[PDB]
Amino acid sequence: DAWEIPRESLRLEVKLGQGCFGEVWMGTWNGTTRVAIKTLKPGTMSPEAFLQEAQVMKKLRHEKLVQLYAVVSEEPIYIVTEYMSKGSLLDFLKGEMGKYLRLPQLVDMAAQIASGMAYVERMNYVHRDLRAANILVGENLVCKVADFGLARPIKWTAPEAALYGRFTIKSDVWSFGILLTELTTKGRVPYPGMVNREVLDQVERGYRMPCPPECPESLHDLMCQCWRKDPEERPTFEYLQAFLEDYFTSTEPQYQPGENL
Numbered sequence: 001d002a003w004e005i006p007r008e009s010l011r012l013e014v015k016l017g018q019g020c021f022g023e024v025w026m027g028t029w030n031g032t033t034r035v036a037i038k039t040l041k042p043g044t045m046s047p048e049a050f051l052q053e054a055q056v057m058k059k060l061r062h063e064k065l066v067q068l069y070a071v072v073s074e075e076p077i078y079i080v081t082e083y084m085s086k087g088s089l090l091d092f093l094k095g096e097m098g099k100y101l102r103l104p105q106l107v108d109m110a111a112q113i114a115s116g117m118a119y120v121e122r123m124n125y126v127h128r129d130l131r132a133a134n135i136l137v138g139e140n141l142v143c144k145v146a147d148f149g150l151a152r153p154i155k156w157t158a159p160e161a162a163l164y165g166r167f168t169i170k171s172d173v174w175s176f177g178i179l180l181t182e183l184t185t186k187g188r189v190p191y192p193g194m195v196n197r198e199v200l201d202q203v204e205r206g207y208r209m210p211c212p213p214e215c216p217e218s219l220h221d222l223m224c225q226c227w228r229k230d231p232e233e234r235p236t237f238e239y240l241q242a243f244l245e246d247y248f249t250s251t252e253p254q255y256q257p258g259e260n261l
């Protein structure tokens, strides 16, 4: 009941779009705090079933994870989170900001995402849908991991997860490696020109995406570590975070900006 707020304290202002979570609004809470607001169509979830799914958002707290702010847990149910001003990392990379981002910006964003996932890792959770569409961007290039597990992606999914349902933090590490290609191509679809069926067996036959143009080989090698066949050999998010945080001193101290990266 601590998270419950009055219905009149939310003002729904702008629809954000119909993605994997239906309609989500930008709005204001208590007239003072900009927030993201989501309501559920009455019927699709009982009030008891929702509060059992609201447990995840009420216990997990990290500066790189989209923060739950409040809840209206009786139908029609409302969920309130912090608001991320720039939308999804996917839209961010494809839009007008894309042309200005270079490797220093893209690596820092990746380090932030790795930091959120390192928190998920430390908590022994799994975020089975890590990809640029599920990262939200705010001011000052702040990136936060969103979790649409309540909403209930072959090209982003580790082979053992897509084929055998072996979803672990290690398959999340595989997805992060795909996410690094979205960052370095400024949001292009991975495995360009390959259909899902084509991606499945090609990857099982050992294929991996090549080094994106102007992406340093050292960053591509990091992607390849994320895409090792045996999940146990993939690096931890703790490792990924440190490698990305330290990247331009320890790993590319001679980096020079190019035309796109």
Ligand SMILES: *CCC(=O)Nc1ccc(CN2C(=O)N(c3cc(OC)cc(OC)c3)Cc3cnc(Nc4ccc(N5CCN(C)CC5)cc4)nc32)cc1
Pocket: 016, 017, 018, 019, 020, 021, 024, 036, 037, 038, 066, 079, 080, 081, 082, 083, 084, 085, 086, 087, 088, 091, 133, 134, 136, 146, 147, 148, 149, 150, 151
């Ligand atoms: C699966 C792929 C997908 O559709 N991903 C996706 C869906 C929805 C949003 C919008 N959200 C959002 O859903 N948030 C959220 C997550 C959550 O976890 C259960 C619960 C919620 O309850 C409220 C909410 C949070 C959130 C925070 N900020 C934003 N900001 C945002 C700003 C701008 C835009 N734009 C899209 C339209 N045009 C093109 C540009 C501006 C979108 C989102 N959104 C969400 C995100 C990802």
